[PDB]
Ligand SMILES: Cc1cc2nc3c(=O)[nH]c(=O)nc-3n(C[C@H](O)[C@H](O)[C@H](O)COP(=O)(O)O)c2cc1C
């Protein structure tokens with residue numbers, strides 16, 4: 001008698017699983033397939049105010065241990081994802097997150113002012129993408145969060161890049177803790193600017209930025225658990241969404257042990273498509289069955305230190 | 307008619323391979339074993355002015371995809387490694403790097419004052435460990451290198467943690483490029499403060515710092531290549547030492563494509579012992595034979611962008 005059920009942000013989620021922002025969530029067909037999937041939720045592609053073409057191809061490469069990408073925010077623009085949230089999305093099936101990646105504070109303000117009414121009306125939840133990248137610039141981070149908090153009369157979350165230093169966990173957590181409207185932290189975005197070299201071609205594998213791109217998949221699992229756990233501990237008044245290196249229910253289990261409420265799936269979803277959510281719910285239930293857990297609350301954040 | 311020979315810092319190296327600082331280079335036995343190995347060179351364990359016990363165990367865990375550690379600078383102290391470099395090391399066999407990780411600017415300044423004479427007399431080469439950690443504080447990094455440059459009348463190199471952002475590559479490169487005595491950059495130290503969770507024990511796998519520790523091995527290879535290439539490009543006046551994710555000659559080949567002169571082996575050496583260097587020399591020669599390269603200079607830094 002087990003349940004993957006999650007209750008947060010005045011919503012019920014059948015399971016903690018959702019796509020990672022920007023994976024299989026750009027087009028109507030992708031958002032519909034995510035909505036029809038076994039996923040507990042979905043998040044729309046990180047949007048700019050206008051349509052963006054993104055970087056030249058190739059800009060994504062599947063790898064044995066995950067993925068490298070420099071997509072360059074290809075998206076249909078805010079209007080498209082706002083309209084999806086306002087008129088098309090079936091909130092009867094599952095809650096919707098809208099990922100926002102304004103290229104300036106002003107763009108985030110303009111989009112948030114217009115998102116306010118649809119959040120109110122329909123219950124779309126903002127994931128503000130902060131992932132120098134804004135979240136690595138504590139002043140730019142504070143300023144963006146101050147602007148969005150000022151103009152957006154709703155709770156939201158922040159998609160954070162990974163940190164690698166306790167001083168940075170502390171500085172990030174201190175800023176996030178100043179903003180009670182930031183009710184979730186998504187840990188993590190890509191491990192930034194890896195470089196994959198193909199030994200056969202003696203070349204990089206993506207065209208933008210000399211082959212440098214965000215790492216996802218198996219590469220990032222320990223970094224993701226560390227950031228999930230770091231912010232779980234440092235932001236006790238906030239929810240942590242896990243993102244990074246989820247291929248299996250066991251990986252999801254580790255996310256939840258580390259403190260994750262929701263568990264986002266990028267690279268694994270990119271490679272397998274939305275049917276992955278049936279497998280992941282099945283596998284996570286299987287993990288909980290072997291371990292005699294009935295709810296996620298029984299082990300969330302209960303990772304044992306030595 | 308192939309050579310792995312490297313020529314840098316008034317020295318000849320049989321091959322680019324050496325231990326990563328802190329791997330099998332703490333004790334006399336380890337330094338002798340590394341000197342008797344097929345390695346082109348060796349670096350002594352990062353030393354403090356005095357002996358350090360390091361962190362409570364377990365503080366290292368081998369993983370399928372590499373290693374997590376929080377060693378906490380367990381080292382025999384500066385005197386012991388200066389002594390090794392002054393009186394014991396067979397410079398006949400191969401050149402020697404001394405890794406220094408003073409817990410302050412003052413500690414590094416005092417050690418370098420004393421290292422100066424042994425560098426002159428015996429030719430030991432300083433690898434200054436800068437891996438918030440000093441290398442993530444651009445002002446503190448500049449201050450450390452200013453203080454060490456003042457009192458150390460020698461070429462040395464700096465062990466860098468990975469950066470994840472072009473603004474950080476640029477900021478770091480700009481600072482390193484002010485110090486002509488910094489003639490090599492070792493990219494990279496561990497991917498910092500990962501968190502491994504054992505799904506069976508529902509626990510972390512290392513005792514210190516609530517399970518948080520530096521990632522090495524297969525986790526870090528693209529980050530390593532990125533940092534090697536990033537500094538290779540931004541610091542053309544300097545040599546790059548590659549460190550991170552080297553298990554094979556093919557991995558070393560990738561390090562050298564990215565711009566690495568010397569290639570340091572950490573996790574793989576830890577798991578295999580110093581015999582790895584026979585396999586790595588053989589495997590790199592093999593890769594070079596299949597690709598029709600006779601010297602490292604022929605493909606070093608020549609990774610093709612799209
Ligand atoms: C093709 C692709 C596109 C992505 N687009 C976005 C994006 O629009 N917004 C965002 O916040 N993260 C984006 N990411 C990062 C993912 O949300 C996720 O943080 C990262 O891939 C790590 O999770 P994974 O290990 O499951 O891939 C993208 C990743 C990939 C691979």
Ligand SMILES: Cc1cc2nc3c(=O)[nH]c(=O)nc-3n(C[C@H](O)[C@H](O)[C@H](O)COP(=O)(O)O)c2cc1C
Nearest residue numbers: 326327328352494495496522523550551571572573
């Ligand atoms: C047990 C262990 C001890 C280490 N000690 C040091 C150290 O003293 N100084 C240092 O600069 N890096 C140290 N490191 C980092 C390694 O030198 C190396 O940068 C890192 O392991 C990545 O290389 P790898 O992927 O080959 O392991 C240590 C790593 C390990 C696993």
Ligand SMILES: N#Cc1cc(N)ccc1-n1cccc1
Nearest residue numbers: 136163164168442443470474
């Ligand atoms: N955050 C931050 C940060 C800040 C400085 N000033 C430098 C490096 C940073 N960093 C390291 C790993 C990833 C980001």
